[PDB]
Amino acid sequence: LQLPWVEKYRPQVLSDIVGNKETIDRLQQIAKDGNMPHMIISGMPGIGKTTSVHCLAHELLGRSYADGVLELNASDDRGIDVVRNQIKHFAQKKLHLPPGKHKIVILDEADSMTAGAQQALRRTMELYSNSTRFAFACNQSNKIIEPLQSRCAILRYSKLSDEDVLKRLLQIIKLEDVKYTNDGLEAIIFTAEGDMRQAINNLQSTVAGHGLVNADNVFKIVDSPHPLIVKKMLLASNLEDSIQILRTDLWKKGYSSIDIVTTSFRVTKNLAQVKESVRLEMIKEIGLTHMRILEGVGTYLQLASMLAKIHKLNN
Amino acid sequence: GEQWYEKFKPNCLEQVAIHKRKLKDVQEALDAMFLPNAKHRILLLSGPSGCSKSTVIKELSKILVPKYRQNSNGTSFRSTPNEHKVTEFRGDCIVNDLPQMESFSEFLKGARYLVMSNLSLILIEDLPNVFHIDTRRRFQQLILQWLYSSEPLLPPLVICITECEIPEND
Amino acid sequence: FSKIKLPSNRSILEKLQVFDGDSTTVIDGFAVIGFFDFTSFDKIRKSTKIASKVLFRMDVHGVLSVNILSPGIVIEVCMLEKESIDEAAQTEIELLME
Amino acid sequence: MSLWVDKYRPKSLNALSHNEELTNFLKSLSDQPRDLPHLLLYGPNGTGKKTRCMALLESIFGPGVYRLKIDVRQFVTASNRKLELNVVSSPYHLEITPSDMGNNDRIVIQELLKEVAQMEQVDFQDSKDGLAHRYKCVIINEANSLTKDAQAALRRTMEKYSKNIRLIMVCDSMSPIIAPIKSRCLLIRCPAPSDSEISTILSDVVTNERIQLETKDILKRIAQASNGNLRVSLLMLESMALNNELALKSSSPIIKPDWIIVIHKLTRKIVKERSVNSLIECRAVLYDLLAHCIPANIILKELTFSLLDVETLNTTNKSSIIEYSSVFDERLSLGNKAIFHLEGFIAKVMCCLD
Amino acid sequence: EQSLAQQPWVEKYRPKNLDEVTAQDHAVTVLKKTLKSANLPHMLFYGPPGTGKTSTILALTKELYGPDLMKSRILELNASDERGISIVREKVKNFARLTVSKPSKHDLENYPCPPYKIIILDEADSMTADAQSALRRTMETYSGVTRFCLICNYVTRIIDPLASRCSKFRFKALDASNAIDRLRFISEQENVKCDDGVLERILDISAGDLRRGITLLQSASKGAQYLGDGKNITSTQVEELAGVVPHDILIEIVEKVKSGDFDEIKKYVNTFMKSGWSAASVVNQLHEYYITNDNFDTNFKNQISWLLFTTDSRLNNGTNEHIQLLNLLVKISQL
Amino acid sequence: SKENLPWVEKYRPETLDEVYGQNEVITTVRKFVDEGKLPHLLFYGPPGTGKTSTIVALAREIYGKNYSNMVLELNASDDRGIDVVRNQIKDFASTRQIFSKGFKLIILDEADAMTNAAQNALRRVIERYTKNTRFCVLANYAHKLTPALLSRCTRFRFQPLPQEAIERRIANVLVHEKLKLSPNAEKALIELSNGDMRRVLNVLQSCKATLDNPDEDEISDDVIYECCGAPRPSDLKAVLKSILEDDWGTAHYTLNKVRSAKGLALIDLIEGIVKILEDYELQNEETRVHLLTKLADIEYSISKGGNDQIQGSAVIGAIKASFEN
DNA sequence: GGAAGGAGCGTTTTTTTTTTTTTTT
Ligand SMILES: Nc1ncnc2c1ncn2[C@@H]1O[C@H](COP(=O)(O)OP(=O)(O)OP(O)(O)=S)[C@@H](O)[C@H]1O
Ligand SMILES: Nc1ncnc2c1ncn2[C@@H]1O[C@H](COP(=O)(O)OP(=O)(O)OP(O)(O)=S)[C@@H](O)[C@H]1O
Ligand SMILES: Nc1ncnc2c1ncn2[C@@H]1O[C@H](COP(=O)(O)OP(=O)(O)OP(O)(O)=S)[C@@H](O)[C@H]1O
Ligand SMILES: Nc1ncnc2c1ncn2[C@@H]1O[C@H](COP(=O)(O)OP(=O)(O)OP(O)(O)=S)[C@@H](O)[C@H]1O
Ligand SMILES: Nc1ncnc2c1ncn2[C@@H]1O[C@H](COP(=O)(O)OP(=O)(O)O)[C@@H](O)[C@H]1O
Ligand SMILES: [Mg+2]
Ligand SMILES: [Mg+2]
Ligand SMILES: [Mg+2]
Ligand SMILES: [Mg+2]
């Protein structure tokens, strides 16, 4: 069978990774130099953290990737016993590598590691840093305990810009010989919201669905991100407009009330235009509505009342 | 590819990045502890990550242990003077005939003997798995027994605890 | 990586045949490798404890069948092979066998 | 000897002396107790609800209901938390206060009571042939303090096992009782005794104890100070008699619960000075009161009604005070920590007064 | 005779068959025809207290299976049982997967014996949302051999997927118009002599709860028997037994509120709460008095309706009766 | 055996051709299986829209009638903790097909009930074994799914069922059974369905049960209202007219009579009146604010019980005060 | 002889269900 495009076109080299140009350039510098230190890679989902770390390890270790890399993630056993035995034995292993090269322990989703295992990793890093180096990958850098953070260079990935997403999408289209239009690519980028995994998934879905990537064809399957709809609903100057948006764009499309209220809270947390008093009052009203929904009254009437109270707060 | 924080590590107490008053307080406390009938048996150091607790402890030991260690009566393990000024507990050590929770209990039962001609400073930085309730209870019991021990001679015991918050985990 | 090799004698290994995946044509010099997770392979230990004879039969679809003969108790164990073998594992296996 | 509250406790229906209509209704209930429904007696605290329940049990069974012993029943939660409850038992009935277990009260309903309901009581007949069966009586003290889960667990236990068990619940207010539970019980209102009846009981006690009384006005004043609570009336009578060499006089002070005087002082301070520092001092007083395990709702009610008695305040101030009291009482009912709500009420009162 | 007279009237007169259930025909007809169609769906009975839900399900099970087969075809769980997520995932799932037990020849000849079991979850609204979610696919997967019956008073407490999976039956309130016949039959069976209109008054006071009405009738009968005068029961005695505030006391409260003096209202309320009247009954009587009064204007009625609603909600939250009553009376006085 | 089943299960779609109201999603998945390029799927939608039916039908189409041998289905009724993900799901996803029948399928129905730890463990299982396995997640609440899992899955939204699809399914059921439905009855059924086919099927089964002679009797809107005990539109209109035009006593009497005629519930009347008022043309916007706030408060109070008469009077007073602005 | 800079202060700790890790077996 044919692999999905997300996995089929996963980059093999750092040069094929787009976005965070300075960070990728630093990674390439490290790869071509060799003296890799303990590092932490943090950022939002689907921006190349796993791809970047794996490509760096591959380029650094060459043929010795199999015997010089130990990869562990949340799907494997990673308790304190694992740190005591498997990681310890790997770090103790005497492996002949080219000068400036070290064994790499990749801990993907390191944030999920237990407190005991994280504390145990301190002594391992202290003892075996001469021949072993650790590459943590996570979404929240603060979820790694401070003693471990103290030894590692931090590297934060930013959300991908529309330009890099468009460039890599054009590369994929050229490889796949996909017919498209500019508006279709713009719609795909808009719906991706900076997540390239979603961008590639939506591109594949659209290409399958109709063959031609148009805006209308893209929007037949992919929907506009609902956080923007919620923001438009909250910022409406008229109660009628807010109610109309809530009905047509959210309720009639099958969005659950709990999702709507959670998204409303998240969006209100980042409303720069509104004042602080109005913002906190809106947060209070949203929380009261959320409490009512959790009790079982997840009705459209409650959301309409929440919108009415928010509009009152605005006035 | 040596890391700078290790490559340029201090080689003497004068280069340790420590406030002068804190260094004086720690040095006086440890020196008093090294007395034959010292009032204090455990020195507990607490603070944030990377504030020179273990570094200053080791640098001070390098001076204090030779000063107070009794000269051997022509007896020693190997030909060399056995430069083991600091004895550290390892939390990842696993032996065949010992349950995990007893490991620390064993360590102290050995550390008790490092006095006089075998004088050494006991340092506890890599603690046992205190997140396990039973292990923490055993650790506390062992600490209390050391504090209340009737042994006339004991070596100075230093416990360095790095204080940090545990991020919420699923 | 460790190895346990059965002797080539008619008291522990009564017979062995490789059929090139069709049960008919015997081929010499070809090696068949089946990758399994021990959590499932070890489930036949209790059956083998009482077994008098064991017959292994692996097909091309990655299915391994173990027939255990202890008038008597007859056991059939069918297991699936893993998706694929890593390059490191293949290299280690080849080095062990050569 | 025993306190006069218990020394002169009536031990029969015919021994009752106030609320004769309630006594007649209880007697009518005991005429044919075979089909006695579950009972829920509600009324002001200290009016004699437990005494009347015991009198009804005595009429149904006999004086042996008053021979009470205490046992300890051990329960284990999901987290292995081991805890204990006191079960007061007589040969004919049982007494429990599940609210003593807080949020774990439901466990008591699910394990203990259910078992009591499931075990049919049978005994060999002394004269006739064959076994004889009798339903067990169970008293639930402080029914209104049960969590909603325990009340829900009570429903099918009451219904299915009606043959083997009859519940008699007692409460001071029915507001916290869920509707399904009220539907399953015969509701009995227990009015407080009038001042005249309290004075008569106190005078009878005085005559029994040979205490010299200058005038009967002292008993009336004690009854007024008790606010209809006969138990408090008797306790203060005993305290005043002992502190006055068993010779009461019109000049003898009336002893009130210490926390009540503390709340009165707090009200006076609140009225006098209104500022942040005054609020902090009031918080200190509130925390001291809570340290003695005084319920937060009781503290709020006492403080509110003490404030409403101040003469200097006007109609608007009192209206605002009662509004805030209602709002913060609801907040306490729906809340987790009482300090927030009491402090908020005091702050709102300070804002309105100033 | 004594054995039969050893039960409270509510349990003594619990309906035995579906024919005895009253005022709930809209669902009883479907349940009855299910005995012939053998096409019972998953059921969600919901309604206010004492409307006949548990009685209906018990009667349906008895009619479907019978005294002997029921013990192997019915699994009942209620609030008194542990119903955590583990219970739902293990015990309920195991019973739902159980093979249908073989009926005996007597059972087949005497009862329809449909080829499935029944799981009854009484007081289902007390179960947690996660535990409810654990039932979703168990109900669908084993619908060929198992049918679920959830019963509740607050339907909003049932998660939406479960409500969608279950056919819904709303039990109506039992009032003087639809439940009078059953109460009259019960009174006749017990030879309870009452004045004309007493049963209607009891039903009106019960406010949709036939269990409360039956208990009130039993209390009145006991009082009359103890008195032993041969006179018929009166509505005044029923009101006194039901905890209804006498009309004169309500009139006094109304005049005090009309006066508008805070101190007099406070003193009167302090004296009134000594009697122990339940605040809910007083609020209901005040609502009936004010809303139906023709001497007040529209604005007053709107404001008082909102005030009464707020006070009733606060009381339902389980608040101090004295404080809430005083606040309501003061607010009405300021209108 | 199908005859004894409830209609909700008796009429479960068996093939993708029987799933209505999801034309775009269905066409996309059908063509994906035709080209054998199925990606990891997420089906997000409200109850009773055809997610489980669609995924089971797709599995049947992919693997014919032996899908149960190469499809691993897990739902909320099963334990799906991190240990389950590590052992069972991982072993199934990392093993070869039974007869090399392309790729294996793992269905996680009601995945919004899974814990955060299990979802986090699922990420690398999904990514590593994409060649041999494909994952399908189904959900009603997206906020319970972690961002990584959402990013890994191609999203498809199951909208509330359109009217035409409901009419076609109802016609299919009516031809299957020997049942007759009136156009007004069908309109009422669609209106009360709220885009849920389960409700339609359950109400239709109850209506058939209600008929004395289903072989010839026709289902009218009155039968539907009786079975559901819901208010008629005329009752709602009369109640609203009395509230907005008559005096307090007349409105109270009208509400009491309308409720006592058929034992209607107050919450149903409130919902109907809210729906009616949502289309009202209001020249003052504060009226809408007051209506929404007060009616939401009354609904919340009703959800916890309370006094019914007081709540009805509250509804009347709230509407009158709101429209007095 | 004024800044500016820095140290020490300002602390204690079960509970509902449900899930998970750890340790000894
Ligand atoms: N910067 C990028 N350039 C090219 N392709 C990318 C990029 N980021 C993501 N992709 C695509 O998305 C796939 C997933 O990338 P990953 O690096 O595994 O995602 P991620 O950043 O690790 O997100 P998390 O933290 O694992 S949820 C890759 O295989 C690529 O196909
Ligand atoms: N001038 C210096 N002063 C102190 N530490 C230094 C210095 N130069 C390098 N280091 C190194 O910096 C590191 C930090 O010192 P540590 O004493 O180990 O930290 P800490 O205070 O003990 O906290 P933890 O528990 O180790 S995270 C050590 O590895 C030192 O060798
Ligand atoms: N419809 C009815 N027909 C006849 N008797 C009824 C009816 N409803 C209630 N009763 C009487 O009230 C008793 C209780 O009935 P139930 O069926 O338990 O009410 P309920 O709906 O279950 O109340 P909840 O919801 O558990 S508080 C019965 O034993 C009957 O005596
Ligand atoms: N699109 C549809 N076409 C035809 N019948 C449908 C459709 N959706 C639902 N149904 C009917 O409703 C029943 C339930 O459908 P499901 O697919 O199980 O509901 P659902 O979408 O999974 O909702 P949840 O998430 O499980 S509550 C099916 O067995 C059908 O009888
Ligand atoms: N009729 C009565 N005659 C004399 N004392 C009474 C009478 N009724 C109640 N009491 C007294 O009131 C006290 C408290 O009554 P109790 O039943 O505990 O109140 P509660 O209703 O709060 O349980 C008892 O100690 C009892 O002596
Ligand atoms: Mg990653
Ligand atoms: Mg250190
Ligand atoms: Mg019931
Ligand atoms: Mg489904």
Query: What amino acid is encoded at F84 in this protein?
Result: V
How far is it, in rounded angstroms, from Cα F136 to Cα F93? Answer: 13
Q: What is the CATH number of the domain that holds D32?
A: 3.40.50.300
Cβ atoms of E216 and E241 closer than 8 Å: yes
Q: Considering CB atoms only, which of A45, A243, A297 is closest to F300?
A: A297
Same structural domain for residues E148 and E22?
yes
Query: What amino acid is encoded at D344 in this protein?
Result: G
Pairing assessment for the beta strands D82-89 and D69-76 based on DSSP bridges? antiparallel
Query: What amino acid is encoded at B17 in this protein?
Result: A
Beta bridge partners of D139: D95, D168
The structure tokens listed for E37 are 């169609």
Contact criterion met (CB < 8 Å) for E215 and D179: no
How far is it, in rounded angstroms, from Cα F318 to Cα E305? Answer: 8
Give the count of alpha carbons within 13 A of D65, CB side only.
24
How far is it, in rounded angstroms, from Cα C64 to Cα F74? Answer: 27
How far is it, in rounded angstroms, from Cα A78 to Cα A80? Answer: 7
Same structural domain for residues D217 and D104?
no
Q: How many helices (H) and strands (E) does chain D have?
A: 15, 11
How far is it, in rounded angstroms, from Cα A260 to Cα F143? Answer: 9
Q: What is the CATH number of the domain that holds D336?
A: 1.20.272.10
D259: CB partners within 8 A, 6+ apart: D289, D292, D294, D302
How far is it, in rounded angstroms, from Cα D139 to Cα D94? Answer: 6
Return the domain boundaries, chain A. Answer: 1-160, 161-224, 225-315
The count of domains in chain D is 3
Cβ atoms of F79 and F87 closer than 8 Å: no
The structure tokens listed for E301 are 């009625």
How far is it, in rounded angstroms, from Cα D186 to Cα D206? Answer: 37
Same structural domain for residues E15 and E164?
yes
How far is it, in rounded angstroms, from Cα F248 to Cα E328? Answer: 21
Same structural domain for residues E34 and E170?
yes
Coil, helix or strand at residue C24: coil
Q: Please provide the distance, in angstroms rounded to a whole number, between the alpha carbons at the two ends of chain D.
A: 52
CB atoms within 10 A of CB E184: 14
Same structural domain for residues D205 and D180?
no
> Tokens 């972690």 correspond to what residue?
F146
Same structural domain for residues E223 and E249?
no
**Could you give phi then psi for residue C2, rounded to 5 degrees?**
-125, 160
Helix (H) or strand (E) holding C79: strand C74-80
- End of a domain among E244, E260, E284? E244
Cβ atoms of F224 and F189 closer than 8 Å: yes
How far is it, in rounded angstroms, from Cα D57 to Cα D54? Answer: 5
Which of D13, D50, D51 gets mutated to test ligand 5 (max ligand atoms within 8 A of its CB)?
A: D51
- End of a domain among D248, D273, D288? D248
Pairing assessment for the beta strands D131-133 and D122-124 based on DSSP bridges? antiparallel
Same structural domain for residues E3 and E148?
yes
For residue F174, give Cα distances in angstroms to D54, D102, F7, F179, F192. 66, 56, 12, 5, 18
Q: Tell how far the Cα of F20 is from the centroid of ligand 4, in angstroms.
A: 10
- End of a domain among D216, D248, D280? D248
Cβ atoms of D271 and D317 closer than 8 Å: no
> What is the full DSSP assignment across B102-133?
GHHHHHHHHHTT--GGG--EEEE-S---TTSH
Same structural domain for residues D315 and D214?
no
Q: Which nucleotide is nearest to D83 (CA to C1')?
A: G15
Coil, helix or strand at residue A109: coil
Beta bridge partners of E174: E208
How far is it, in rounded angstroms, from Cα F217 to Cα D345? Answer: 66
Beta bridge partners of F219: F181
How far is it, in rounded angstroms, from Cα F155 to Cα F48? Answer: 18
Q: Determine the Cα angle at D316 with ends D313 and D319, to 5°.
A: 95
Cβ atoms of F46 and F92 closer than 8 Å: no
**Could you give phi then psi for residue F50, rounded to 5 degrees?**
105, 20
Residue positions counted in chain D: 354
Same structural domain for residues D147 and D232?
no
Cβ atoms of E323 and D301 closer than 8 Å: yes
Q: Determine the Cα angle at F286 with ends F284 and F290, to 5°.
A: 130
Same structural domain for residues D47 and D166?
yes
D221: CB partners within 8 A, 6+ apart: D254
How far is it, in rounded angstroms, from Cα F130 to Cα E288? Answer: 69
CB atoms within 10 A of CB C96: 11
Q: Tell how far the Cα of E122 is from the centroid of ligand 4, in angstroms.
A: 26
How far is it, in rounded angstroms, from Cα F10 to Cα E213? Answer: 43
Contact criterion met (CB < 8 Å) for F202 and E167: yes
Same structural domain for residues E138 and E217?
no
> Tokens 């309730």 correspond to what residue?
B133
Same structural domain for residues D169 and D238?
no
Q: Which residues of D214-252 are buried (b: 16+ CB within 10 A; e: fewer)?
A: eeeebbebbbeebebbbbbbbbbbbebbeeeeeebeeeb
Pairing assessment for the beta strands D93-96 and E117-121 based on DSSP bridges? unpaired
Same structural domain for residues E16 and E148?
yes
Cβ atoms of A217 and A262 closer than 8 Å: no
Residue positions counted in chain E: 335
CB atoms within 10 A of CB A168: 20
Taking the Cβ of residue A225 and every Cβ of chain E, the question of whether any pair is shorter than 8 Å is answered with: no
H-assigned helices in A150-250:
162-176, 182-192, 196-210, 215-221, 226-235, 239-245
The count of domains in chain E is 3
How far is it, in rounded angstroms, from Cα C92 to Cα D14? Answer: 98
How far is it, in rounded angstroms, from Cα D263 to Cα D308? Answer: 13
Give me the resolution in angstroms, 1 decimal. 2.2
Domain that holds residue D345: 258-353
For residue B92, give Cα distances in angstroms to A122, D217, D241. 11, 83, 75
* DSSP type of residue A13: S
User: E-assigned strands of chain E?
Assistant: 43-46, 74-77, 117-121, 146-152, 167-170
Same structural domain for residues E133 and E209?
no
Same structural domain for residues E11 and E82?
yes
For residue F245, give Cα distances in angstroms to A162, F144, F193, F248, F277. 59, 47, 32, 10, 15
CB atoms within 10 A of CB D348: 17
Coil, helix or strand at residue F127: helix
Cβ atoms of D131 and D88 closer than 8 Å: no
Q: How far is CA D83 from the centre of its chain?
A: 24
Helix (H) or strand (E) holding F73: strand F71-74
D31: CB partners within 8 A, 6+ apart: E222, E225, E226
What protein residues have CB closer than 5 angstroms to ion ligand 8? E 54
User: E-assigned strands of E222-281?
Assistant: none
Cβ atoms of D129 and D122 closer than 8 Å: no
How far is it, in rounded angstroms, from Cα E83 to Cα E122? Answer: 11
Four-CA torsion B129, B133, B135, B137, nearest 10 degrees: 130
How far is it, in rounded angstroms, from Cα F125 to Cα C83? Answer: 13
Same structural domain for residues E233 and E305?
no
In a domain, D182, yes or no: yes
Domain that holds residue E227: 175-244
Cβ atoms of D105 and D147 closer than 8 Å: yes
How far is it, in rounded angstroms, from Cα E326 to Cα E312? Answer: 13
Phi/psi region, residue D16 (left: phi>0; alpha: psi -120 to 50; beta: rest), is beta
> Tokens 């101040």 correspond to what residue?
D310
Pairing assessment for the beta strands D212-213 and D165-171 based on DSSP bridges? unpaired
> Tokens 């339902």 correspond to what residue?
E316
Method: cryo-EM
- End of a domain among D248, D275, D292? D248
Residue positions counted in chain C: 98
Same structural domain for residues D128 and D77?
yes
Q: Considering CB atoms only, which of F147, F148, F296 is closest to A302?
A: F296
Residue nearest the C1' of G25 (CA based)? B99
Taking the Cβ of residue A100 and every Cβ of chain B, the question of whether any pair is shorter than 8 Å is answered with: yes
For residue D132, give Cα distances in angstroms to D165, E11, E118. 15, 21, 36
Q: Considering CB atoms only, which of D152, D162, D176 is closest to E126?
A: D152
Tell me the chain E residues in contact with residue F205 when contact means C-beta distances shorter than 8 Å.
39, 41, 167
Q: How far is CA F64 from the centre of its chain?
A: 28
How far is it, in rounded angstroms, from Cα E135 to Cα E149? Answer: 12
The structure tokens listed for F285 are 């916007």
Same structural domain for residues D243 and D299?
no
Chain E: closest CA distance from residue D11 (Å): 22
How far is it, in rounded angstroms, from Cα A308 to Cα D335? Answer: 26
How far is it, in rounded angstroms, from Cα D100 to Cα D145? Answer: 9
Q: Which of F122, F135, F108, F107 is nearest to F38 (CA)?
A: F135
Same structural domain for residues D270 and D143?
no
Beta bridge partners of D89: D69, D94
Cβ atoms of E251 and E212 closer than 8 Å: no
Cβ atoms of A290 and A261 closer than 8 Å: yes
How far is it, in rounded angstroms, from Cα D131 to Cα E284? Answer: 49
Q: Which of A17, A157, A119, A135 is nearest to A72 (CA)?
A: A135
Q: Please provide the distance, in angstroms rounded to a whole number, between the alpha carbons at the two ends of chain B.
A: 36
Pairing assessment for the beta strands D93-96 and D82-89 based on DSSP bridges? antiparallel
Q: Which residues of E249-270 are buried (b: 16+ CB within 10 A; e: fewer)?
A: bbeebbebbeeeebeebbebbe
Query: What amino acid is encoded at E106 in this protein?
Result: H
Same structural domain for residues D31 and D49?
yes
Q: What is the CATH number of the domain that holds D205?
A: 1.10.8.60
C16: CB partners within 8 A, 6+ apart: none
Same structural domain for residues D167 and D73?
yes
Cβ atoms of E164 and E195 closer than 8 Å: no
Residue positions counted in chain F: 325
CB atoms within 10 A of CB B128: 21
How far is it, in rounded angstroms, from Cα E140 to Cα E147? Answer: 9
Cβ atoms of D11 and D50 closer than 8 Å: no
Q: Which of E7, E9, E6 is nearest to E212 (CA)?
A: E9
Same structural domain for residues E18 and E166?
yes
Cβ atoms of F42 and F153 closer than 8 Å: yes
How far is it, in rounded angstroms, from Cα D146 to Cα D108? Answer: 11
The structure tokens listed for A87 are 């990681």
Residues with CB under 7 A from strand G: A 79-81, 114, 116-117; B 19, 21-22, 25, 99-102, 129, 131-132, 134-135; D 77-79, 81, 102-104; E 84-86, 128, 130-131; F 79, 81-83, 115, 117-118
> What is the full DSSP assignment across E20-52?
G--S-HHHHHHHHHHHHH--PPPEEEE-STTSS
